[PDB]
C-alpha cells in the first residue's frame, strides 16, 4: 500500500524565504488592485460640495449659500469648488480645511454686532445673487458717505457655548491708496484681535494685483478658535470685513477630495480621488494617499500567499 498527496497540472508560483518561483497547488492575492470608480456613500450623511469651496461654507459666497449649516459624516471637495467670490484667500487655509473636514458640519450663530457711525452694506458684482451682493456670513464695513473718516472701533464677542467657536474676519486690500481713502479715509489703518490664546493685529496694504473676476482688490481672510467663555475683541479703524455669524463644529466626519460620482449602492471606508477601495486584503497598490480605514499601501503590485501544498506533478 502507498500513501501520498494530491497534485495539479498547472499550479501557481509563489515566493518564500528560500526561493522565488515555487509552484504550489493554490494561492490567493494579498495586495488589492481592484478599484471602484465611485464614492461609495451607502449609509453615510454625504455632502458633495461641488462648486462650493470648503472654506466658503464659513464665509458664504453665492456658491455656498446652501452649505452654510451643512451636516455630514462624509465631506467631498471638488476641483471646481471655490472659497471666494471676491478675490482673496485664507491665512492658515489648510489647517482650517483639515479642521472642517472632521467637524461633522457647522452650526452658525449670530454674533450680534451692531454699528453706529459707519456704513455696513458693501457689495460687489463678483458675489452675484439677485444683483450685486457679498459674503452671506460677513459684512463689508465702509465709511458713511463721500469718503470721510472711519472712527476707531472696538467690538467684543464672548463665546457662551461649551464648544470652541470659529471666528473669521477679513482685511480689505484695495487696488490703490486712493481707493483705500475713498472707502475708509486716509491714514494708517490697524486691525487688532485678541483673546486668551490669540494675539495678532493686521495692517492693510493697497496696491495693484492681477484682475481676478475683473477685480484688482484682494480680501485676506483670518480665523481664530475661541474657547468656551473666552472673549475676543477687534479694534479696527478701516479696511475691515466684519464677521456677522460665528461657527461651531457639529461633531465628527471625514473629508476627501475626489472627481468621481457618489454611489449610495456600495459601502466603503477607504477613499481616494479615483474612487473607493473595498477589500479585505491587508495591502493595496492603488493609492498611497488613500484615507479612511484602508489596507496599508505597498509598492508591490502583487504578493501571492500560498493556500495549498507544494505542487509536484508527474
Amino acid at each position: 500500500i502507498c500513501l501520498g498527496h494530491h497534485a495539479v497540472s498547472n499550479g501557481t508560483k509563489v515566493n518564500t524565504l528560500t526561493e522565488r518561483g515555487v509552484e504550489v497547488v493554490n494561492a490567493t492575492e494579498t495586495v488589492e488592485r481592484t478599484n471602484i470608480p465611485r464614492i461609495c456613500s451607502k449609509g453615510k450623511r454625504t455632502v458633495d460640495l461641488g462648486q462650493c469651496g470648503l472654506l466658503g461654507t464659513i464665509t458664504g459666497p453665492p456658491q455656498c449659500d446652501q452649505f452654510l449649516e451643512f451636516s455630514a459624516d462624509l465631506i467631498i471637495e471638488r476641483r471646481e469648488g471655490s472659497d471666494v467670490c471676491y478675490p482673496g484667500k485664507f491665512v492658515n487655509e489648510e489647517a482650517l480645511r483639515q479642521i472642517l473636514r472632521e467637524s461633522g458640519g457647522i452650526d452658525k450663530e449670530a454674533m450680534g454686532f451692531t454699528y453706529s457711525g459707519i456704513r455696513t452694506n458693501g457689495a460687489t458684482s463678483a458675489c452675484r445673487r439677485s444683483g450685486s451682493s457679498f459674503y452671506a456670513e460677513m459684512k463689508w464695513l465702509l465709511s458713511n458717505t463721500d469718503n470721510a473718516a472711519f472712527p476707531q472701533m472696538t467690538k467684543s464677542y464672548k463665546n457662551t457655548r461649551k464648544s470652541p467657536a470659529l471666528i473669521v474676519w477679513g482685511i480689505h486690500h484695495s487696488g490703490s491708496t486712493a481707493e483705500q481713502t475713498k472707502l475708509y479715509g486716509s491714514g494708517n489703518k490697524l486691525v487688532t484681535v485678541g483673546s486668551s490664546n490669540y494675539q495678532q493685529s493686521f495692517v492693510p496694504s493697497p496696491g495693484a494685483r492681477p484682475q481676478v473676476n475683473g477685480l484688482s482688490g484682494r480680501i485676506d481672510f483670518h480665523w481664530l478658535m475661541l474657547n468656551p467663555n473666552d472673549t475676543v475683541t477687534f479694534s479696527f479703524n478701516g479696511a475691515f470685513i466684519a464677521p456677522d455669524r460665528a461657527s461651531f463644529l457639529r461633531g465628527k466626519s471625514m473629508g476627501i477630495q475626489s472627481g468621481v460620482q457618489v454611489d449610495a449602492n456600495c459601502e466603503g471606508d477607504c477613499y481616494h480621488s479615483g474612487g473607493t477601495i473595498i477589500s479585505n486584503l491587508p495591502f493595496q497598490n492603488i493609492d498611497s494617499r488613500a484615507v479612511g480605514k484602508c489596507p496599508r499601501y505597498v509598492k508591490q503590485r502583487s504578493l501571492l500567499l500560498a493556500t495549498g501544498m507544494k505542487n509536484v506533478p508527474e
Binding site: 500500500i1 495591502f283 509598492k299
Partner: protein, 163 residues
C-alpha cells in the same frame, strides 16, 4: 516531496489519500482527517491575514491646492518611509507564511506516513519510496481497516513474519 518522488494528479477527492493494489483490485481514497487538518490550518492563516483595521487616517495633503513646499516635503518623506516599512513587512510576511505553509503540508504528510507505519508493526516493511510492503495478501476489508485505523497489529502477525 521527500520519498514520494511525485504527486497524484488523479486524486481529486482530497489532499492526502491512499492507493492500494492487492489481488482484489485497485483503490484510491482520500484521508479526510489529515486533509481537514491542513485545510483548517491554512484557513486559520487566511483568517489572521485577511484583516480589517479600525484605524482611520485623515488627509494631511491637498491634491487641488498644494500645501507649503517644506511641510509637503516632510509629509512626502514620512509617507515614503512608512510605505517602505509596509512593503518590507508585506514581502517578508508573504515569504515566511509561504515557507511555513509548505513545511506544514510536508510535515502532515510525514506524520501520516509514520502513523500508518506504526499501525503495521512487523507485518510490513518500508520499501523506501513512501510505500509499504505487506508480506501477506491483505484484502479490501483489511484495507478499509487500515484506513480507519482498526487493523489488528497481531492478528495478522505470525503469517507475515513467516514471509
Amino acid at each position: 516531496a521527500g520519498f514520494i518522488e511525485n504527486g497524484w494528479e488523479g486524486l481529486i477527492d482530497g489532499w492526502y489519500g491512499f492507493r492500494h493494489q492487492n489481488a482484489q483490485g485497485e483503490g484510491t481514497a482520500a484521508d479526510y482527517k489529515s486533509t481537514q487538518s491542513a485545510i483548517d490550518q491554512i484557513t486559520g492563516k487566511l483568517n489572521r491575514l485577511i484583516e480589517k483595521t479600525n484605524q482611520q487616517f485623515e488627509l494631511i495633503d491637498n491634491e487641488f491646492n498644494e500645501v507649503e513646499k517644506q511641510i509637503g516635503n516632510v509629509i512626502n518623506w514620512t509617507r515614503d518611509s512608512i510605505t517602505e516599512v509596509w512593503s518590507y513587512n508585506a514581502e517578508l510576511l508573504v515569504a515566511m507564511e509561504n515557507q511555513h505553509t509548505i513545511d506544514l503540508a510536508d510535515s502532515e504528510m510525514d506524520k501520516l506516513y509514520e502513523r500508518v507505519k506504526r499501525q503495521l508493526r512487523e507485518n510490513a516493511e518500508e520499501d523506501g519510496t513512501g510505500c509499504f510492503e505487506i508480506f501477506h495478501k491483505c484484502d479490501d476489508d483489511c484495507m478499509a481497516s487500515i484506513r480507519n485505523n482498526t487493523y489488528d497489529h497481531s492478528k495478522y502477525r505470525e503469517e507475515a513474519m513467516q514471509n
